[PDB]
Design an enzyme around this catalytic site. Structure first.
Site, mmCIF file in Angstrom:
data_model
loop_
_atom_site.group_PDB
_atom_site.id
_atom_site.type_symbol
_atom_site.label_atom_id
_atom_site.label_comp_id
_atom_site.label_asym_id
_atom_site.label_seq_id
_atom_site.Cartn_x
_atom_site.Cartn_y
_atom_site.Cartn_z
ATOM 1 N N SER F 86 0.857 -1.188 0.000
ATOM 2 C CA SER F 86 0.000 0.000 0.000
ATOM 3 C C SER F 86 0.891 1.235 0.000
ATOM 4 O O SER F 86 1.650 1.425 -0.968
ATOM 5 C CB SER F 86 -0.960 -0.097 1.182
ATOM 6 O OG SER F 86 -2.241 0.400 0.833
ATOM 7 N N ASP F 160 -5.714 -5.961 -5.559
ATOM 8 C CA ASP F 160 -4.437 -6.139 -4.885
ATOM 9 C C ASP F 160 -3.464 -6.855 -5.811
ATOM 10 O O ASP F 160 -3.744 -7.963 -6.282
ATOM 11 C CB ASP F 160 -4.625 -6.919 -3.588
ATOM 12 C CG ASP F 160 -5.319 -6.103 -2.517
ATOM 13 O OD1 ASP F 160 -5.894 -5.046 -2.854
ATOM 14 O OD2 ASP F 160 -5.279 -6.514 -1.337
HETATM 15 C C1 LIG Z 1 -3.669 2.590 -1.506
HETATM 16 C C2 LIG Z 1 -2.381 3.021 -0.819
HETATM 17 C C3 LIG Z 1 -1.744 4.134 -1.645
HETATM 18 C C4 LIG Z 1 -2.704 3.500 0.597
HETATM 19 C C5 LIG Z 1 -3.776 2.615 1.248
HETATM 20 N N1 LIG Z 1 -4.423 3.355 2.321
HETATM 21 C C6 LIG Z 1 -5.872 3.447 2.413
HETATM 22 O O1 LIG Z 1 -6.535 2.914 1.588
HETATM 23 C C7 LIG Z 1 -6.523 4.217 3.574
HETATM 24 C C8 LIG Z 1 -7.211 3.215 4.510
HETATM 25 C C9 LIG Z 1 -7.479 3.837 5.882
HETATM 26 C C10 LIG Z 1 -6.534 3.745 6.891
HETATM 27 C C11 LIG Z 1 -6.784 4.311 8.133
HETATM 28 C C12 LIG Z 1 -7.982 4.968 8.371
HETATM 29 C C13 LIG Z 1 -8.927 5.058 7.363
HETATM 30 C C14 LIG Z 1 -8.676 4.491 6.123
HETATM 31 N N2 LIG Z 1 -7.505 5.176 3.090
HETATM 32 C C15 LIG Z 1 -7.607 6.513 3.659
HETATM 33 O O2 LIG Z 1 -6.888 6.857 4.536
HETATM 34 C C16 LIG Z 1 -8.656 7.489 3.135
HETATM 35 C C17 LIG Z 1 -8.693 8.785 3.624
HETATM 36 N N3 LIG Z 1 -9.604 9.630 3.174
HETATM 37 C C18 LIG Z 1 -10.478 9.240 2.261
HETATM 38 C C19 LIG Z 1 -10.440 7.942 1.773
HETATM 39 N N4 LIG Z 1 -9.530 7.097 2.223
HETATM 40 B B1 LIG Z 1 -3.207 1.273 1.878
HETATM 41 O O3 LIG Z 1 -2.327 1.616 3.250
HETATM 42 O O4 LIG Z 1 -4.470 0.274 2.302
#
Ligand SMILES: CC(C)C[C@H](NC(=O)[C@H](Cc1ccccc1)NC(=O)c1cnccn1)B(O)O
Ligand SMILES: CC(C)C[C@H](NC(=O)[C@H](Cc1ccccc1)NC(=O)c1cnccn1)B(O)O
Ligand SMILES: CC(C)C[C@H](NC(=O)[C@H](Cc1ccccc1)NC(=O)c1cnccn1)B(O)O
Ligand SMILES: CC(C)C[C@H](NC(=O)[C@H](Cc1ccccc1)NC(=O)c1cnccn1)B(O)O
Ligand SMILES: CC(C)C[C@H](NC(=O)[C@H](Cc1ccccc1)NC(=O)c1cnccn1)B(O)O
Ligand SMILES: CC(C)C[C@H](NC(=O)[C@H](Cc1ccccc1)NC(=O)c1cnccn1)B(O)O
Ligand SMILES: CC(C)C[C@H](NC(=O)[C@H](Cc1ccccc1)NC(=O)c1cnccn1)B(O)O
Ligand SMILES: CC(C)C[C@H](NC(=O)[C@H](Cc1ccccc1)NC(=O)c1cnccn1)B(O)O
Ligand SMILES: CC(C)C[C@H](NC(=O)[C@H](Cc1ccccc1)NC(=O)c1cnccn1)B(O)O
Ligand SMILES: [Cl-]
Ligand SMILES: [Cl-]
Ligand SMILES: [Cl-]
Ligand SMILES: [Cl-]
Ligand SMILES: [Cl-]
Ligand SMILES: [Cl-]
Ligand SMILES: [Cl-]
Ligand SMILES: [Cl-]
Lengths: 183, 183, 182, 181, 180, 181, 185, 178, 179
Positions: F86, F160
């Protein structure tokens, strides 16, 4: 799902002089089973009562209530081990009228010494432990009474959990007939 | 929190050869107390150790660990009952060097037989019950050793919870002096 | 977080000031008694200032602090700040006569001990007698320091009795109600 | 924790190791680290190991045991309060003639306990491993108590409680001393 | 009985000893990797002692520790203390050849990776494929250091396999079983 | 945390090494950015090593670290240890070109941002439009550092996508897959 | 709730009049009791009329499913088992326990077979007793499956070591069921 | 509940399939369908569907029961027919699948979970993929669509109006008034 | 299962009670009562008493479609309150047969919901909740004889109305006190 209507399916079997002792055995199940046995004795003190047992065990006092009622009523009782007859179930299974303790081919029978707890002051611990030992000797005497085994054999067998096939439980004296299809 | 000086307040008292046994007594409290008693013996096997007790009781084995350490080290031990010395706390109070067991005027002392629990098969229940009875006679012997009382009087007094004033405990033999102000 | 001057309480302990604030349990009793013994070792003549802001607590824990106050040779100036209820008022009145002070807007509450019991009837009676023994014991301690008869102590502490600093001075709990330093 | 450093660090200077409370991987790590540190300071000076434990993890206790037998230092075990389950194994694991106990301690020995879950194949594997530890611990006890495997199995089949004298007779400890001789 | 005094593990780190005890996650992986890098910067030739008492843990964190072991130039002496299960057994076999040791009464456990998956069927297939890649990946790592066949590794690690120090020495997980 | 003679991570920070391990949130972003600013103040020319073992985290936290990585003038050597999923994969590809390394048994995962939305239908539109902007923004960042077309980024990160170190080297996420230096 | 057909009764009572026993959902001592009670009631009404048993179960307790199994083998009535939705774990054993030639399955059902799972806790002596009993049940259920599927014990052990999923045609080849039927023939 | 009203509708040969679908709901629906067939294997059976979906095995049990019984089945989408509900809506007799004006139809691929060792994880994933193809073929059968369009439409959550579903082949008639 | 049931007695008088929160369960009971009352007589009117703070959108649209489908004129009565979906069903009554007691209240607002998942999923759910927003806006505009702009401006936030205000807006027809 729900109790099927024919009254409930168990009321129909009670008319056929069949009592189901399935599931854990507590004072509630003891009350229902003793009530059905007394009703079946009042209907006829000579006709046999069939008792189907699929129990994993339960309270000692509740099962002994069922046991004494079985020995008190004049009706012969045909015990049938279905699925499993463990702990108190095995005592009720062996408590049937001599020659009428049956078991299905794939049942299992388990015998073991009582388990329990104790808490309080050292005086209360000793009173509770003295009582649970009396129960251990009491049930050993009941098993030795019906299996016609020596108390030494009962002590050695029920010290730990002892599992028996229907043929093994017949050899031990807990039941009398292992039948697949009805003769 | 622990106040600091120029170490913590209890460390400053440990320099003054003072060990605080306050609060319930478990294996963690026994570790710290025994560690302080051994440290104080290595510094001087002749200087007295002042042990201040404000405990409602605790584990038997942990309190007996503190008791044996008190009797092992050659240092005279001045036990001081402050607030209360209940259950094991009262045994540690009486375990002090004879003539050096003190108590403040408004403290209270409680003595009672050991309490506990037991769970498992009947054979296990007997094992735990026989062991808690051994501790009962063992602790009665320790009290009778330091209170100069008969073993019967110890049995009769500690059957239920027995509360004593500092004077009642001095008459019982648990402590030696009840002092309001230092002479 | 304790402000690092060490912690501010240690700085006041160097100034011979012991804070007995919050509910009084075996933990508070240990620290307060330890601070009192340390201050007596440093000087068995210099006075010790005990600041009290307590809603009460365990009887045995407060009686441990009370007996330690009476045992040490040092005069103890008890200061009621905020409130001194239940055991707090006892430690307030336990100060050296003439040195039991209070701020103008503090409050003092006195009432009989409370507790519980559970078990067989024999055990219930043992605990009941004991909580009555504490009741008489605390009443005598109040009568000792307030210079009151046992009749007045029993009548006042039967229910929750709240006192202004003047009312507690009249009753004998404290001695001086000051707004500004003497 | 009193400051003198912590009171346990001062006893570690005196070559004393406290094994009190339940025994898990964290307790084994601290005990082994102190033993190795004490061997680096002097592989000839004795190490005093004070035990007040009701037992704990089998693997963690065997880690402490193997570290005791590996280091060249003689180890004087002292049963204070109680040495039950793994604690009694560590008590018996002391250097012959240096396994002591306070008069009012108690020693408990029993067979290992555990659990198993999964398919019938998994249940069988865990049960075989729980039996291997049972025989392995029985052999260790028979080694240091100088007892036959017959007596070890009969004693440790159920919970067995022993006074310091009874454990001295059984071979768990060597001396029961009230005051230091 | 409470972080003896600096911490006893810092004194052992001066003696080039790294303790890998308890479950293995990203936190344990961070500390272990930091200690190994520090010990390499101090001396990139001196051996590093790595004591292992782990029931296993995260695959990714354990593979982080494994790759750092192989990357640093220092010889690493792995010591099986108490137990070395799951990832702990991989790190034990990850030592420098001839320097993998075990105490007499230790036990070594090897098994295939376990995990979970949740979501749509397309997602479910993605994580299951990744799970299998790790299964083959760990099987190749074990076969590398144990000098065993991939068939032997699949048969042994299909179910939970418990080994004594001598059995693990024969299997190739460790080299020397100290005894007294 | 072990102590040298300070914590082991501070010793690595002296070696100009920043650890980005574990989940990535505002707290982890605050520490990583603070270390990067400290290392630039010590020397705006010496390289900074960034070891990444993260399963991902918050989008804004990871983009804060990314923008800090792009701002400072120090060449940054990003290393994939264990895994970089991610946001961890983004910061891995955000390294100075030619200095993004990965150990042989690490893994790299890329996927579209995930989130949630709740409220009135208008608020659901505002929140859903924002997460679409993040999807295009992160796709553009990945296409910038991986030298890949935006179509390839959309096709790969829709679900993924798991990649070995060699697969991520071909995709352009990292530069070198080293075993021994 | 249960719909009523007008006496008065639930919809399952009406199907019980038509000699249809429903074994759907998890199989415990409570489900085994109702199934066995209905089978005995149907045998007392007529020991020759066939009994239809509809199965949509994910499995359940071994002792309860064996209680249903032995009751089926005991009563003289031919029993037509019908696999609807799914017959997993103990449900698959009850599907194959039907009268030969009367084990049916709908086209989109699924049949799953695996070895019994369980747990054990206590002293090492206890653990060894539970593990042995769990193995007895494994050989016992293997013998029951080999009996009704007409398969060798080797095939049963190799198939049921892990979770084995089958289509209705795959279970018919294996011997679990006899006929896969779309519409009524 | 006011016998019960659903019994009165069952007398009128109406089976209500409303709410989530599990093994319990599947048993009741199948029991009602069998009772209605025993009453008359020729008269139609009305099946009112308002379900957000449920278990795959349970919904497949209702579907096969719908295909097995001889009675023509009139499916009516009221409120919504999502996940398994849309399959039971399409499972109606050809030309007898109806929908009210403000109804909603949703279709998506099966969802689930897996846990255990790697060997187990594979076994569960292979089975949930079989259900994915199985449900795709069932949808392609009643909607007269190619299997490729079924994969594409059900790869993510697809919401359809009553007229859109009629275009896709899920239902046949979108009525406002009879 | 309280009085001897009173709702069955009201159903005999062709009265359907839609009170409390509206879900698939309440929708199933209301639709079944409406179909039963149509089978008895497709000409006699059906009285529908509403005391609901709202509920699920799909459940309320199911009841709405059933109201419009059946040929019986439906007399809707706002008792206590008719909020969210409760106001739609009140306005769904046969024109001229939408009543309200004097001290009731009627609330109209835009649909509310939530979404969770990947950005692709989040959009699909957000797109659908917008469809429901326009759909409910058109339904309200159909029965209230109001323009789409008035519907959008009024229902953007929570809009509370007295029975008289709802009569002018077009939600109900008659505000009666003593008949
Ligand atoms: C896709 C890559 C670039 C980053 C990914 N991060 C996310 O999808 C994260 C998942 C998350 C983590 C903690 C709290 C809430 C949500 N998405 C967000 O932070 C988020 C923030 N604002 C609007 C929409 N999504 B990964 O760490 O799953
Ligand atoms: C050995 C045979 C006679 C009975 C077995 N059950 C028992 O012994 C039961 C199991 C149990 C019951 C209640 C709470 C905890 C444990 N033990 C007792 O009933 C019991 C009764 N009084 C004192 C101590 N234990 B078995 O499960 O039927
Ligand atoms: C009676 C005096 C001498 C000592 C007392 N200690 C105990 O009662 C303690 C506290 C306790 C622990 C568990 C359950 C109940 C009570 N009892 C024991 O330590 C204990 C030890 N072995 C068997 C049974 N109880 B006191 O400190 O409460
Ligand atoms: C009455 C004044 C002198 C002291 C008061 N202390 C107490 O009431 C305390 C606090 C307490 C503890 C448990 C349950 C209820 C109350 N009561 C006791 O200490 C206590 C002691 N023995 C028996 C019963 N209660 B006060 O609340 O500080
Ligand atoms: C028997 C002596 C030698 C050691 C004993 N240790 C254990 O019993 C411990 C603690 C425990 C854990 C779960 C359930 C019950 C008990 N048992 C184990 O360590 C253990 C290890 N592997 C498999 C099964 N059990 B003792 O410390 O309780
Ligand atoms: C089998 C050996 C080599 C490694 C073993 N580790 C694992 O199985 C670990 C333990 C774990 C961690 C998180 C969630 C579930 C399970 N499994 C994984 O790391 C993992 C990786 N990808 C997908 C699912 N699980 B062991 O340390 O338990
Ligand atoms: C494998 C086939 C033959 C039967 C399967 N049944 C089981 O695995 C069941 C599930 C269960 C039920 C009650 C308590 C614990 C576990 N296992 C047992 O009944 C059981 C019986 N004895 C020892 C251990 N487990 B299936 O229905 O999951
Ligand atoms: C896609 C359509 C056909 C079915 C959808 N639901 C499912 O697939 C459900 C989702 C679910 C939710 C809660 C508890 C258990 C299962 N999944 C299954 O039925 C299922 C069946 N076998 C293997 C894995 N999953 B829908 O939400 O009803
Ligand atoms: C605005 C008026 C017309 C209708 C209102 N209904 C809603 O807001 C309902 C409340 C609800 C019910 C079940 C699950 C989630 C949310 N919203 C929805 O049904 C809904 C449906 N799809 C997407 C988003 N929201 B009201 O609360 O009855
Ligand atoms: Cl009789
Ligand atoms: Cl004084
Ligand atoms: Cl050794
Ligand atoms: Cl040694
Ligand atoms: Cl290396
Ligand atoms: Cl840069
Ligand atoms: Cl048959
Ligand atoms: Cl059909």
């Amino acid at each position: 799902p729900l109790i099927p209507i024919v009254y409930d399916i168990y009321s129909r079997l009670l008319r056929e002089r069949i009592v189901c002792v399935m599931g854990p055995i507590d004072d509630s199940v003891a009350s229902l089973v003793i009530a059905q046995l007394l009703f079946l004795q009042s209907e006829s003190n000579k006709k046999p009562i069939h008792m189907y047992i699929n129990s994993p065990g339960g309270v000692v006092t509740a099962g002994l209530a069922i046991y004494d009622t079985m020995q008190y009523i004049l009706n012969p009782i045909c015990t049938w081990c279905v699925g499993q007859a463990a702990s108190m179930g095995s005592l009720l299974l062996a408590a049937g009228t001599p020659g009428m303790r049956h078991s299905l081919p794939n049942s299992r029978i388990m015998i073991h010494q009582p388990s329990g707890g104790a808490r309080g002051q050292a005086t209360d611990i000793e009173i509770q432990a003295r009582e649970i030992m009396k129960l251990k000797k009491q049930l050993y005497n009941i098993y030795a009474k019906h299996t016609k085994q020596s108390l030494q054999v009962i002590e050695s067998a029920m010290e730990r959990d002892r599992y028996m096939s229907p043929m093994e439980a017949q050899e031990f004296g807990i039941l009398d007939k292992v039948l697949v299809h009805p003769p």
